[PDB]
């Protein structure tokens with residue numbers, strides 16, 4: 001056990017076994033200021049959980065999806081990503097490709113929603 | 123792409139392929155006005171997510187359920203519902219029976235929640 | 245139908261028929277008193293949903309886990325728990341064993357999260 | 367390779383936010399506007415860049431210390447009736463405390479609107495301005511009315527912890543040679559800061575936190591003479607205050623339920639109020655300051671300490687509060703030396719009762735007399751120097767801006783915004 | 798016919814920044830802002 005953000009400097013493979021530690025800490029003059037800090041924490045948490053549900057990843061911490069990895073985003077191989085890079089370094093590399101990936105996941109699930117809707121119709 | 127509420131005039135069959143568009147737009151002196159509207163948007167969103175949870179439809183946009191259609195709520199066949207009417211025309215038709223169906227969906231899930239629960243005990 | 249908390253005195257077996265009755269009733273300067281009570285109910289509800297989500301129980305009123313029941317928590321047989329005790333009596337008996345159970349359920353899910361994630365790549 | 371989304375990554379960006387107070391007889395910075403406290407996690411291999419000079423906690427703490435000051439003065443007496451004409455005579459009519467006082471007689475309102483009250487009080491010469499037993503008036507009477515410093519609230523600073531809200535973290539630089547800027551090899555995530563006492567003072571950082579290994583010199587741009595130099599000591603220099611007089615507070619009923627506390631009589635030791643700093647301890651502390659100050663200007667340069675140039679009494683003197691009564695010490699014997707490559711120092715201090723504290727105009731405060739003898743024990747834990755624009759560098763004491771006082775306590779802290787959503791390539795493929 | 802036929806040149810005692818001192822001042826007030834009390838008194 002490392003603690004909150006303990007694996008920030010750890011490799012992506014090693015830091016992915018402690019996702020629960022960071023996940024559980026995202027939810028919980030000194031009056032309204034302290035009260036609006038709690039409402040901001042809930043709204044920030046709820047819009048992240050909404051994104052997971054839209055991508056079909058609701059209730060999951062590691063969600064393998066159907067969107068293929070465009071090599072333009074990152075040409076590195078798996079060995080030097082999950083064993084040589086940390087999540088802070090990785091976020092810097094793909095910070096500009098984040099929004100195009102988000103749209104790809106959003107539409108891919110929307111296609112899967114109608115694909116399973118038609119399969120159940122038979 | 124049509125946009126938010128763009129398929130409001132589209133038929134029910136065509137407007138059900140754009141649910142992700144409306145779903146993601148339900149979440150995002152003079153300081154409480156901004157703040158109290160945000161809290162009411164979060165509360166309303168959670169009420170509809172709670173209803174989907176107790177119907178067994180959590181994390182789904184199209185959720186086929188086990189509740190039969192009585193035909194006393196609407197005698198129209200599938201051809202003239204999903205290819206002629208729009209979701210606004212349909213909403214004005216079963217508004218009377220909305221709470222009748224909302225009770226049947228909750229009751230069906232609760233019975234289904236235990237039939238599956240009793241099945242795992244074998 | 246007994247109503248909200250109607251099965252409080254029923255046995256644990258009979259009180260489990262009506263988990264949806266209590267579940268739906270947990271969610272719904274004088275304005276601030278009402279407004280701060282609304283925010284407290286929302287974040288209190290979300291912390292319970294978050295706990296279920298990290299145990300792999302999200303969207304389920306009854307969830308089966310992979311944590312064996314250590315007899316140290318309670319050595320009473322299954323027949324004298326679901327047909328003789330009420331839920332209020334049970335909560336007082338395992339009150340001190342609650343937190344150690346909560347950690348085991350969290351450790352059981354993320355073990356299944358990674359094992360299924362690993363097996364899914366084969 | 368495919369995009370996989372990780373939620374909860376340890377990634378943070380710099381951010382400005384509203385940190386809430388926390389603390390562990392009412393106070394100016396009371397616990398009724400704060401939260402009870404309860405912690406520190408060492409972030410290995412993390413090298414963050416701090417900047418104590420563009421830190422928003424310093425700017426926010428200045429706003430909050432001011433805000434708690436005004437909030438603590440509204441519910442108590444406003445001295446509008448104290449703008450009358452004063453018939454003031456000397457107290458001594460001849461080096462003492464009594465040469466600093468005027469014995470002022472005036473007509474005051476009674477608790478009954480139609481009745482007056484011939485009363486008198488001893489006012490410091492720094493609070494009365496002559497009108498042309500002569501005729502005087504209180505000094506802040508053409509600018510504002512002085513809300514009386516409420517007698518049941520204490521000016522003693524209690525430690526306050528500034529704690530970050532959810533989604534934010536406070537990074538603490540644990541480096542012991544960290545000046546104020548650049549990378550910090552040792553970083554930690556604290557729930558929130560150590561107890562920062564809001565000690566209000568000028569030219570000297572009374573009480574507070576010491577340096578760890580050696581005297582630290584901290585300037586935004588050491589080559590710019592317009593920037594204050596925040597010296598931080600490693601061993602504190604103890605300074606002892608006093609007002610030897612046995613004051614006699616007197617109560618005047620200026621209205622229904624309102625009382626005005628006045629100096630009725632002064633007896634006892636009438637030596638001028640003063641502060642004592644050990645001459646041996648101060649000399650070796652300036653020796654350490656000079657040693658750490660030649661590193662930025664040269665080994666052969668001449669470091670000379672002069673006294674304050676000029677301006678307001680709040681900026682030319684070591685203004686501070688001690689025992690509820692506000693002192694203004696000369697500190698011209700402290701800063702008087704030239705450095706080439708049992709005894710004590712007595713600093714004559716004046717006292718005022720009408721205080722314009724936060725360098726503002728239009729909001730004064732009347733500090734009521736403190737009954738008895740006032741005694742004082744403080745630690746000089748730092749300095750605020752200004753450099754003069756040749757082989758000789760002259761360092762005069764500085765101050766005025768109260769933010770440099772709290773910039774010396776919040777130099778090691780930094781607020782960051784957690785960015786928990788990150789994408790990265792992996793051999794995954796959604797099924 | 799002029800603007801000056803719409804104005805009254807009103808002189809009054811006003812308080813000073815010192816409570817015990819008065820201030821004999823004057824101002825031009827529009828006739829629409831002053832009501833007579835029964836150099837008249839308005």
Ligand SMILES: *[C@@H]1O[C@H](CO)[C@@H](O[C@@H]2O[C@H](CO)[C@@H](O[C@@H]3O[C@H](CO[C@H]4O[C@H](CO)[C@@H](O)[C@H](O[C@H]5O[C@H](CO)[C@@H](O)[C@H](O)[C@@H]5O)[C@@H]4O)[C@@H](O)[C@H](O[C@H]4O[C@H](CO)[C@@H](O)[C@H](O)[C@@H]4O)[C@@H]3O)[C@H](O)[C@H]2NC(C)=O)[C@H](O)[C@H]1NC(C)=O
Pocket residue numbers: 612613614737738739
């Ligand atoms: C500095 O100067 C001050 C005066 O400004 C000195 O203070 C006075 O000290 C004398 C003793 O030296 C005190 O006289 C005694 O009174 C006590 C009982 O006093 C009580 O009632 C008083 C009247 O209401 C009250 O003032 C007292 O003090 C309280 O209230 C004041 C504010 O008003 C506050 O400042 C204080 O802190 C107190 O809360 C107190 O309630 C009496 O018992 C004494 O003993 C004599 O009488 C007995 C028999 O009764 C006899 O046996 C003894 O031998 C002795 O003769 C005596 O009458 C006086 O009350 C003090 N006055 C004030 C205003 O406090 C102070 O001592 C000087 N200090 C120095 C450093 O020299």
Ligand SMILES: *[C@@H]1O[C@H](CO)[C@@H](O[C@@H]2O[C@H](CO)[C@@H](O)[C@H](O)[C@H]2NC(C)=O)[C@H](O)[C@H]1NC(C)=O
Pocket residue numbers: 451452453471472473484
């Ligand atoms: C307090 O008020 C009295 C009057 O109520 C002042 O006494 C007057 O002083 C003026 C001179 O300025 C004389 O012309 C009057 O004759 C005095 N009236 C008396 C003595 O009844 C007195 O000066 C005031 N005291 C102050 C302002 O300290």
Ligand SMILES: *[C@@H]1O[C@H](CO)[C@@H](O[C@@H]2O[C@H](CO)[C@@H](O)[C@H](O)[C@H]2NC(C)=O)[C@H](O)[C@H]1NC(C)=O
Pocket residue numbers: 495508509
């Ligand atoms: C309020 O009155 C004080 C005292 O008269 C004014 O300060 C004086 O200003 C003159 C003119 O510059 C100086 O010569 C005096 O030395 C000042 N006296 C002190 C004690 O500083 C002050 O300017 C007045 N304020 C306003 C707003 O009118």
Ligand SMILES: *[C@@H]1O[C@H](CO)[C@@H](O[C@@H]2O[C@H](CO)[C@@H](O)[C@H](O)[C@H]2NC(C)=O)[C@H](O)[C@H]1NC(C)=O
Pocket residue numbers: 522523565572573686687688689690741742743744745
């Ligand atoms: C610096 O800290 C010291 C110690 O806390 C302060 O002195 C204390 O002041 C309070 C209130 O006046 C007294 O009750 C204590 O007895 C004092 N302690 C000692 C050891 O004398 C001092 O006032 C502070 N300096 C400031 C605030 O400028």
Ligand SMILES: *[C@@H]1O[C@H](CO)[C@@H](O[C@@H]2O[C@H](CO)[C@@H](O)[C@H](O)[C@H]2NC(C)=O)[C@H](O)[C@H]1NC(C)=O
Pocket residue numbers: 696698
């Ligand atoms: C502060 O101390 C200084 C130095 O003691 C005082 O000012 C000077 O004192 C020396 C001799 O002590 C004189 O030769 C100078 O002419 C003084 N300069 C002045 C009076 O401007 C000073 O009086 C003390 N107090 C203040 C408030 O400055």
Ligand SMILES: *[C@@H]1O[C@H](CO)[C@@H](O[C@@H]2O[C@H](CO)[C@@H](O)[C@H](O)[C@H]2NC(C)=O)[C@H](O)[C@H]1NC(C)=O
Pocket residue numbers: 808809810821
């Ligand atoms: C301003 O006040 C003065 C008095 O301070 C007024 O002058 C007085 O007027 C009355 C008539 O109403 C006379 O009986 C007094 O003798 C006057 N006193 C003097 C001249 O010292 C004056 O009228 C006031 N001006 C106004 C109200 O515009």
Ligand SMILES: *[C@@H]1O[C@H](CO)[C@@H](O)[C@H](O)[C@H]1NC(C)=O
Pocket residue numbers: 070071072073
């Ligand atoms: C991959 O990204 C490039 C831009 O970086 C884009 O032009 C290309 O269309 C993308 N390929 C796919 C299959 O999305």
Ligand SMILES: *[C@@H]1O[C@H](CO)[C@@H](O)[C@H](O)[C@H]1NC(C)=O
Pocket residue numbers: 192194
């Ligand atoms: C349809 O609703 C009516 C009441 O409106 C009810 O009597 C009837 O039983 C329902 N149909 C079925 C099949 O349950």
Ligand SMILES: *[C@@H]1O[C@H](CO)[C@@H](O)[C@H](O)[C@H]1NC(C)=O
Pocket residue numbers: 314315316317
């Ligand atoms: C049950 O809990 C006890 C502690 O009370 C512990 O000693 C024992 O090993 C546990 N049984 C297991 C882990 O099987």
Ligand SMILES: *[C@@H]1O[C@H](CO)[C@@H](O)[C@H](O)[C@H]1NC(C)=O
Pocket residue numbers: 006007008009010409410411
């Ligand atoms: C820092 O790096 C070392 C090896 O370079 C590693 O052993 C250690 O775990 C890292 N720190 C953290 C907090 O993971």
Ligand SMILES: *[C@@H]1O[C@H](CO)[C@@H](O)[C@H](O)[C@H]1NC(C)=O
Pocket residue numbers: 456459460465
């Ligand atoms: C009052 O004191 C001042 C300064 O100490 C002095 O100039 C003045 O002459 C004194 N007034 C007297 C003695 O009447």
Ligand SMILES: *[C@@H]1O[C@H](CO)[C@@H](O)[C@H](O)[C@H]1NC(C)=O
Pocket residue numbers: 545546547548549585586587588
């Ligand atoms: C403070 O220290 C850092 C790191 O040693 C250095 O880069 C910076 O220049 C120093 N500050 C000044 C004002 O020189």
Ligand SMILES: *[C@@H]1O[C@H](CO)[C@@H](O)[C@H](O)[C@H]1NC(C)=O
Pocket residue numbers: 606607608640641642710712
């Ligand atoms: C300061 O020192 C002088 C003698 O140098 C002494 O008389 C006085 O009492 C001292 N005051 C304090 C507060 O130490």
Ligand SMILES: *[C@@H]1O[C@H](CO)[C@@H](O)[C@H](O)[C@H]1NC(C)=O
Pocket residue numbers: 604605606642643644710743
């Ligand atoms: C300050 O006072 C303390 C006792 O309160 C004494 O021990 C110390 O020597 C004094 N120091 C100076 C510099 O006056």
Ligand SMILES: *[C@@H]1O[C@H](CO)[C@@H](O)[C@H](O)[C@H]1NC(C)=O
Pocket residue numbers: 673674675676682683696698
């Ligand atoms: C600084 O000292 C000089 C004499 O050394 C004095 O004239 C001047 O007033 C002092 N300035 C202050 C104390 O601000």
Ligand SMILES: *[C@@H]1O[C@H](CO)[C@@H](O)[C@H](O)[C@H]1NC(C)=O
Pocket residue numbers: 573602743744745
């Ligand atoms: C000054 O600091 C010392 C330790 O450095 C401490 O023991 C003493 O109480 C402090 N004096 C104060 C805060 O008045």
